[PDB]
């Protein structure tokens, strides 16, 4: 069946019938500078060579037109001294554009048209150099390779803690760099029909992350199983253990938000758990272990699971039995 | 489909007609090319 | 069909041998392109067969449906169920047309691409014949067979 | 200052080729928006391709790099304009259109300067053709801005790209692709590659566009039938179908005739090449390449358009005769079988006749051009040869008819055999309980021999057909070449004449077979439409 | 009548009698660099050409003043060798300023005044180049074209959900890029008179966004109708359904805050709903639909609305009737 947001974190819902009238502007550069380093280097050298060849062609043309390209001694001074063929013209173009200035071929004060072509060449070169420097620096601020490494266990379990049914699901870090003020927005979607005859195709509702006195955030150093307890007030409290495996369509998504240290940007990780993904009555294997002088975390047992002799019943019927016991 | 179905189909015919067909086809095509090959020398 | 397949394959082999004997170097240029055709072969059959059978299937319940309407015609005109049955028949004829349409589209695809290659080969053959068989070989009876 | 004007022409192509590369590399590093004049633009671009090939031929004949560089630059300029219009059709912009318009204007100016400096003194025709094509493309761009919001007031009032072929999952997108792929079927690459791996099914297949359904074709056909019956039959239903399917069929037919012309044209440039070398040939070779590819492309587009018109017609008349099945009376077993044959064989006959309709218009012009062309290459002797090949076409038809007759007889026997089998494969336990099975197998084999006897004559006729197929090509050349040189005028037969005659013989043998099947299909379709009219009007 | 903040999100309240004494400083550059790309390119080339022409004029003047401009052989060496007219002077200016250095015309060690003019020319050129590079890079960080695309439905509705009156209003995204930790600040303004005789011209009060156990934020993937239920404690609980359409002056504003992903900046969208804009007793059409293998959202039905046979009465009287039923 259809999923809401994929496991990798990307969104699945495809948008249809967007007005699309406003998206008719020139946002050309930034999108090109976001590209991969090889593609971005390719387009940068492409822009540079394009401008260089354009102005080399126009300079060869103007030297041909003035007649200074026609080899002749006397009765004239070439607008650009010592210019002979297209090769020397391209050499002059690259000498004046990238601001090396060899000065073997000299532009003279006889032709103001060469003055104009130089005065536009230099400003366009400076503008393209400025954009191609700002964009590559904005690129070198890419820390996206280090982000999105956060991992959740493939399937989440439910258990019986403190006499109440509880949700257990593993999170964790994958690098030395921490994530500041990471908060959990745990939500559940379902096609719901209101008592007023209204049917919604999908209904997001907040299921709380059960921490201390309050708080929507957590602290991530070691893999910490997020601990929620479904009660009679919780929206998930009504389902059954035998109907979730095959038929029902329930997506439980978690949205872990937090700002990375070095860059300061606020990233997040979204993941879904379907009705066929989640299972019943199990327990994770303890990861942390008292090593020689530290705490050793084994990620091989991260997704491992052991059987637990826990009663299997619906949360509504379990609450009724708690009222009876 | 493998060559086995066609192999059985043509072996039901027997060795008598298999070669009589194949070599005759080869020779007809050889004649059809050789006529034009000789016409090429005919031209000049 | 067996006779036609044999005639076609032998005529093709004969034509390749002719255009090779006319211009030797042209031979070495034609083996690349022919290998291209190999890749065009596989991708075709594994679909051309498939679509084919699909056509057959969309032809079978359609006709049968027709017959069912003819016999129990009084019952269907009595129940006033004519609208739903017309909907079903539009559905069936659409399912037939999509198959019989994709099949002709795929045949056109294979046709056009094989033809583009069959024109590349005559281009290369003529380009080699005009130079090799005239500038150096200076033999005119060759180019005729190759071009034809 | 010829080289000066040549460089002045080289400049704008460089300008466009340099502006395109950043945007092309951004685009290279699912809604199709079409603009007015898209098909016209692609047609004009292909004509530009042809004229640039001609300019390259001129530059080769002249040689001086700077004297033929403009053609090689305009080639890449037109290719990059194609890439630009692809990038605009895939994502619309009001600015890339202006970027193309500027280049069009500058190229027009340079060509005008060339024309003036030439008038003050082969080049003339090519320059004029380029001027005209660039001007028409400029007018197309002006139409686009007049229709778009490029420089017009605040908002463009855009078209809201068509949801007919771009809405909820559809896979067969023929009407909604680039007019080049509408010809070369490039959109099928993805389908066929995915099909190689995963087995196709109706869930993996698309859904038919709004342009071709039961409802659409039924609507057009019933509108034509209404407009024809309000003015009040077999001729009526015929003219109704004709006026209802209209432009597509004649479009296919004219594609077909143009392809036939170019196909008759190929061998003549072969002849010219053969003449030139024995006594201006590279140009003829590249022209042959271009003409081959274009002729075959047009032939294939013709086939497809005809097939699609036929499929439309089948869907339409099928849902129509089903609509008639609702209002018929109960007084009219045999009628049920006749109805289901009216859908299983009569409708297929109608649709296959509509397949072969444009071939019936394109065959006569093909044989006429063939005979007149071969006459001017071989003289009076050609006429004699032109008879022999033509004489195969009626004979073929006769042969075909015999086949049909034989078929009928054979079918009869076959049916009876099946009956004598259906018993044995039902009384199986009864049969084997006393081993009377061999006694019935003897009877079954008795039927089989009669069936075998019919098959001999059928296969004899098949053999005669296959024999004539490759005998008439040999006989034409035999009785023509022997009857030309050693009979009539002893004229020296250059290799060009003989090989052009050979090519034309094959190019004429291929269509000849199809005329017989076309005649049979046409008469059978006429009978089937008379039957459909008799039924539909009871 | 007068609105508080316009639909587009801009503010309507015009400020009068600002002290304005502090706003007398030179913040010149940043405001110029914020301008449109065409205007900004125009002012950049304008600054460059201005500096170039200024120093070209001063160099022509100094060459004229030393007498080196007077064409003469011997008895002198020009402070700048091979200088003839104003054209060659401007060429020397553009050769030394933008650091190409052709070297056909050479400044000599005879005149220290030329040394001083060069030593100020180069530093002013470097400073203007540095500011004109930093500013264009700061400009290329403009992601404002992608922001503010968030859309709300033109008019909001009220319905009866779970036996209580409720507020329904659509929000939504318009691009693939998400918005992190978007929170809703829903407020209402009204001219209020306290029981102590105090009359306030406008009174903002927080009306809650009803989510799970807590939370002021939401999660935006698909258009999610914000769901609030007015109770006896809510400030909006006292109004009437027939007096809102024409006479009353009630502006209900929503402030949706959130940080975009790629840039990390915290943007927001503010919108108002007047008394004449909001209507009574209706229901939105379900947007999401179970497509082939995904969820299809149709934005044509975004603002569409269907009639619902719901009772029409005031929220105070509705609560009294709930006490009676
Ligand atoms: C044998 O060619 C020709 C050569 C020359 C000429 Cl002047 C005409 C034809 C010719 O054939 N006349 C056009 C009409 C026609 C009929 C069949 C074909 S087809 O290619 O054999 N078949 C398909 O495309 N699709 C089939 C169509 C039936 C349903 C199943 C898919 C192609 C075209
Ligand atoms: N040892 C590990 N170290 C780091 N990341 C891991 C490790 N094992 C799994 N992961 C990732 O974190 C997620 C945890 O899921 P698992 O516990 O591995 O269950 P799983 O069924 O084995 O999933 P797999 O290994 O991808 S088939 C997986 O999606 C992995 O991509
Ligand atoms: N299909 C759409 N896609 C994207 N944005 C839309 C779409 N329709 C409307 N919007 C915008 O989001 C807001 C939603 O209001 P609507 O549902 O369109 O009510 P409305 O009375 O039709 O307003 P309009 O269309 O501007 S006259 C509008 O202000 C539009 O600017």
Swiss-Prot record, chains A, E:
Presence of keyword rRNA processing: no
Transmembrane segments: 35-61, 112-140
Amino-acid positions noted as binding K(+) 1 in the UniProt annotation, renumbered to this chain: 99
BP term (GO), one: cellular response to nutrient levels
Location in the cell: Membrane
Residues that coordinate or bind ATP: 17, 19, 299
Membrane topology: Multi-pass membrane protein
Reaction(s) catalysed (UniProt annotation): K(+)(in) = K(+)(out)
GO cellular component: acrosomal vesicle; axolemma; cell body fiber; cytoplasm; endosome; glutamatergic synapse; intercalated disc; inward rectifying potassium channel
Binding site for K(+) 2: 102
Record GO terms (molecular function): ankyrin binding; ATP binding; ATP-activated inward rectifier potassium channel activity; ATPase-coupled monoatomic cation transmembrane transporter activity; heat shock protein binding; inward rectifier potassium channel activity; potassium ion binding; transmembrane transporter binding
Extracellular side: 62-85, 103-111
Ranges in the topological domain labelled Cytoplasmic: 141-325
Site positions for Role in the control of polyamine-mediated channel gating and in the blocking by intracellular magnesium: 129
Key words, A-Z: ATP-binding, Disulfide bond, Ion channel, Ion transport, Membrane, Metal-binding, Nucleotide-binding, Phosphoprotein, Potassium, Potassium transport, Transmembrane, Transmembrane helix, Transport, Voltage-gated channel
Assembly and interaction partners: Homotetramer; the homotetramer binds four ATP molecules (one ATP per subunit). Forms an heterooctamer with ABCC8/SUR1; one KCNJ11 homotetramer interacts with four ABCC8/SUR1 molecules. Interacts with ABCC9/SUR2.
Domain notes: There are two PtdIns(4,5)P2 binding sites: A canonical site where the phosphate groups of one PtdIns(4,5)P2 molecule are coordinated at least by residues Lys-36, Trp-37 and Arg-145; a non-canonical site where the second PtdIns(4,5)P2 molecule is coordinated by both KCNJ11 and ABCC8/SUR1 residues.
Primary role: Inward rectifier potassium channel that forms the pore of ATP-sensitive potassium channels (KATP), regulating potassium permeability as a function of cytoplasmic ATP and ADP concentrations in many different cells. Inward rectifier potassium channels are characterized by a greater tendency to allow potassium to flow into the cell rather than out of it. Their voltage dependence is regulated by the concentration of extracellular potassium; as external potassium is raised, the voltage range of the channel opening shifts to more positive voltages.
Protein name: ATP-sensitive inward rectifier potassium channel 11
Organism (species): Mus musculus (Mouse)
Gene name linked to the record: Kcnj11
Residues of the full protein shown: 32 to 356 of 390
